[PDB]
Write a protein that binds this ligand. Sequence first.
Ligand SMILES: Cc1cc2c(nc3c(=O)[nH]c(=O)nc-3n2C[C@H](O)[C@H](O)[C@H](O)COP(=O)(O)OP(=O)(O)OC[C@H]2O[C@@H](n3cnc4c(N)ncnc43)[C@H](O)[C@@H]2O)c(O)c1C
Length: 367
Amino acid sequence: PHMGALHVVIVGGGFGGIAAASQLQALNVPFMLVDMKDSFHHNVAALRASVETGFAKKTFISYSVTFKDNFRQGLVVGIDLKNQMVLLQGGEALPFSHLILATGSTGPFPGKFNEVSSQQAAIQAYEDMVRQVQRSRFIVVVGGGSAGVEMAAEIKTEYPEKEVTLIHSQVALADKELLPSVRQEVKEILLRKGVQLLLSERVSNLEELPLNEYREYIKVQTDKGTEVATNLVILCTGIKINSSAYRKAFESRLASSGALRVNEHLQVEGHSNVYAIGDCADVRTPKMAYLAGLHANIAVANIVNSVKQRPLQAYKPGALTFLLSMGRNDGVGQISGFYVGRLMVRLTKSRDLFVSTSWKTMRQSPP
Ligand SMILES: Cc1cc2c(nc3c(=O)[nH]c(=O)nc-3n2C[C@H](O)[C@H](O)[C@H](O)COP(=O)(O)OP(=O)(O)OC[C@H]2O[C@@H](n3cnc4c(N)ncnc43)[C@H](O)[C@@H]2O)c(O)c1C
């Protein structure tokens, strides 16, 4: 029973959620931000944190330092649409006048990390990975999506003396929606770095392999009968929408891919006070962190505009921007649908992986 007042609940503390929480905090609008972790995860640097000693502490930022009592650690199990509540594992419910859904994507470690944990435990998880990689002479990266391609390049750039094999089910690497010129140069670069590519093969004994853990001997098998002996197997396939929090309640609304369908104001179909942003929004985009932030300014503005009776603003997708990091000294990609080269990507993404951006948003300084 909110009797006109606002109470905004942000479910998910990723790039979008912290963008929305910071906007609401600047306008002094009551809000509660919920995340299962206690710190924000700059997952765009997760692969460098998998290979560089001491980097991982640059990639987690305490929520409570920035948001204080406007943050609440918890796992969201369900939405009660009728009574405008948000159901937390353990019983607690959070009442909202407006709801921002920002639940991001789920995937294998190290590319994603969606574990309830402390900041120091999360950091330690990546430092542990680095020791697995240091220990290993032979490493297999499974999956030539954008994540595997960068993971293999990241290992070879930091450890030229390791033997890195990348195994991928198709014949072209990285996202299908990229310029063919982009996809080809990614192959050129991986080969010049000494990565051994096993294209058009599928790993067949995967349920039996130890993941993210050094072993003296591991044999990876493919459906074509190729056997690759290795010390470490890193899995880089299986990014999907994290609908844990909202699926039971919006089944009618979830598009097939897990995302919530939305209008051009990022409103969830069938609701005027429920927004979806970033990865969980059905936008036919490639799903980018920077987009998650833009969506967040859109959603907060449209909550304020909906109270101040004003025309909502819309989200106008443009041409494809995505830069692939090929280690710290190389890369390639496209900015608004045209090709950008190695020097450009190295200065934009590959040196700092946009890490300083999240620390600025969170108003904190890295350790
Ligand atoms: C895999 C990958 C992705 C890249 C990459 N690079 C870029 C890049 O250069 N630029 C960019 O803009 N995006 C890039 N992205 C995409 C970017 O990582 C994602 O699109 C971005 O993180 C999406 O932002 P969202 O806020 O939509 O989602 P997050 O996963 O960041 O945050 C979701 C949060 O919700 C929380 N959460 C979800 N369900 C929950 C629940 N039920 N209860 C509690 N918390 C929950 C999660 O724990 C997590 O903290 C990249 O190189 C790779 C390899």
